[PDB]
Amino acid sequence: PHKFWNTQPVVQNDDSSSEYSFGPIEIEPDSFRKEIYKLPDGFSWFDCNLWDIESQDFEDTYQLLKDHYVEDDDSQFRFNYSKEFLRWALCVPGQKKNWLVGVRVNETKKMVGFISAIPIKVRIHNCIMNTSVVNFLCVHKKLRSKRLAPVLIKEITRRIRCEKIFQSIYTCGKNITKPFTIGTYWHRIINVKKLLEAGFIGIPRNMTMSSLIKYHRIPADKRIEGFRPSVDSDAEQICKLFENYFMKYKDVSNETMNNLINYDEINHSKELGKQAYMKLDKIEDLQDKITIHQCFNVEDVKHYFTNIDKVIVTYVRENKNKEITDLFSFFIIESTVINNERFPTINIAYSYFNIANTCSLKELFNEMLITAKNNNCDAFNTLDLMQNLQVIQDSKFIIGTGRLRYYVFNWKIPQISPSNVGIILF
């Protein structure tokens, strides 16, 4: 029984709609609460100054997440996002100062809560829109189970709506309301001895450390040439590469892709916003296609698909005309090994966006796995989004624990396969 989520414009688990459709759940451009939400006495909101990596706010945020953010099931690993990562992930083109929200104890100046939104452009079927991604919701462990989280969620909702944005995308490792897709975690072991020492895997009875090393080795043969790190001057080419990829896997006609309904222009009117509703005759119309994905202009490409040591790795393949034809990318997050004083962290790569045109996706990932090994990553993690199952199948990836639930706030999306989703959250 929910007490907060049952009041929100999201599809509920008990929803009994017998039709597949798309569109906003509600069009309420001026009826939302505009007054700041009250925090418990002694606590105050503040806009978190992540615009200078040396600021005190950035140290406070880094420390809060380091000790209190997402942990695995058994509380053996906790994410340890670096400050350079958080800057790359949160100070994105178009970001607003007030979408990085902290909660501080007034007497001690201790930061005890955080929630963030980043602006992104997304296509959802026949619509395109400026939207938000909510991430890094975090409450101090000593303040949990006191119903603070709905306060932080309502407050970021208010701050997003003040920017005339009424939808959001977010993920969760547990079921809340009805998710529009469910992602499966997959792990590729790179550094066996480190992951054994960390307790992530163990040594099977029918194996040895040496046979494990042998089994999990990244294949060294069949190397395809032409790959190099991306640079800023690649941005226009990379932008075109992404447009052609999303055009290839579209779930709407060519004319539709070229004339997407821009919800930003009609979300101010209950009558005009109705144009965004779209009934789907057959669910099979979407099979093998991408239905929802982020859209990147040249400025976004320059920011996201770059190379920052220990944060983000982007390589492109060139042909004999020196034209970019393929791309792989992954970001890098350390995790704390909670109960290991002498081996306190591991370095994990996470697949981001990958486009294979001149090679198979399996060959592309093999080149990416080698590069992640050479970037000192102990494992390579992926979701079964987009065409990744092609590589996950008949590979040495091992399934993870739990599932990643995808949600859209104030939009209707039929339950779809993760192959239909091109949205990666940090």
Ligand X SMILES: CCCCCCCCCCCCCC(=O)SCCNC(=O)CCNC(=O)[C@H](O)C(C)(C)COP(=O)(O)OP(=O)(O)OC[C@H]1O[C@@H](n2cnc3c(N)ncnc32)[C@H](O)[C@@H]1OP(=O)(O)O
Q: Which stretches of the chain bind ligand X, using CB under 6 A?
A: 2-5, 68-70, 132, 134-139, 144-150, 153, 156-157, 160-161, 166-168, 170, 172, 176, 409-410
Residue with tokens 């932008």: 239
Distance CA(381)–CA(187), nearest Å, equals 5
Residues that bind ligand A1BHP (CB under 6 A): 70, 72, 77, 171, 173, 185, 187, 200, 335, 346, 348, 350, 379, 381-383, 400, 404
What is the distance of C-alpha 390 from the center of its chain?
Answer: 20
Q: Is 38 in the site for Cl ion (CB under 5 A)?
A: yes
* Rounded least distance, CB 386 to ligand A1BHP, Å: 13
Residue nearer to ligand X on the CB measure, 179 or 422: 179
Q: Which one of ligand X, Cl ion, ligand A1BHP, none interacts with residue 274, CB within 5 to 8 A by kind?
A: none
Distance CA(72)–CA(187), nearest Å, equals 14
Q: Residues marked as binding for tetradecanoyl-CoA?
A: 2-5, 136-137, 139, 145, 147-149, 174
Contact residue for Cl ion among 5, 37, 185, 249 (CB under 5 A): 37
Residue with tokens 């990147």: 296
How far is CA 229 from each of CA 76, 266, 306, 377, 426, rounded to the nearest angstrom? 34, 41, 8, 17, 21
Distance CA(424)–CA(404), nearest Å, equals 11
Residue nearer to ligand X on the CB measure, 156 or 286: 156
Contact 382, 392 (CB under 8 A): yes
Of the candidates 367, 402, 364, the one whose C-alpha atom is nearest the C-alpha of residue 383 is 402
Alpha-carbon dihedral angle through residues 159, 408, 146, 47, given to the nearest 10 degrees: -30
Distance CA(1)–CA(230), nearest Å, equals 49
Of the candidates 298, 294, 371, 391, the one whose C-alpha atom is nearest the C-alpha of residue 329 is 371
Q: Is 97 in the site for Cl ion (CB under 5 A)?
A: no
Residue nearer to Cl ion on the CB measure, 330 or 406: 406
Q: Residues marked as binding?
A: 2-5, 136-137, 139, 145, 147-149, 174
* Rounded least distance, CB 288 to ligand A1BHP, Å: 22
Residue nearer to ligand A1BHP on the CB measure, 76 or 256: 76
Residues 6 or more apart in contact with residue 253 via CB below 8 angstroms: none
* Rounded least distance, CB 131 to ligand X, Å: 8
Q: Which one of Cl ion, ligand X, ligand A1BHP, none interacts with residue 278, CB within 5 to 8 A by kind?
A: none
Q: Which one of ligand A1BHP, ligand X, Cl ion, none interacts with residue 157, CB within 5 to 8 A by kind?
A: ligand X
Q: Which one of Cl ion, ligand A1BHP, ligand X, none interacts with residue 147, CB within 5 to 8 A by kind?
A: ligand X
Write the single-letter amino acid at 268. H
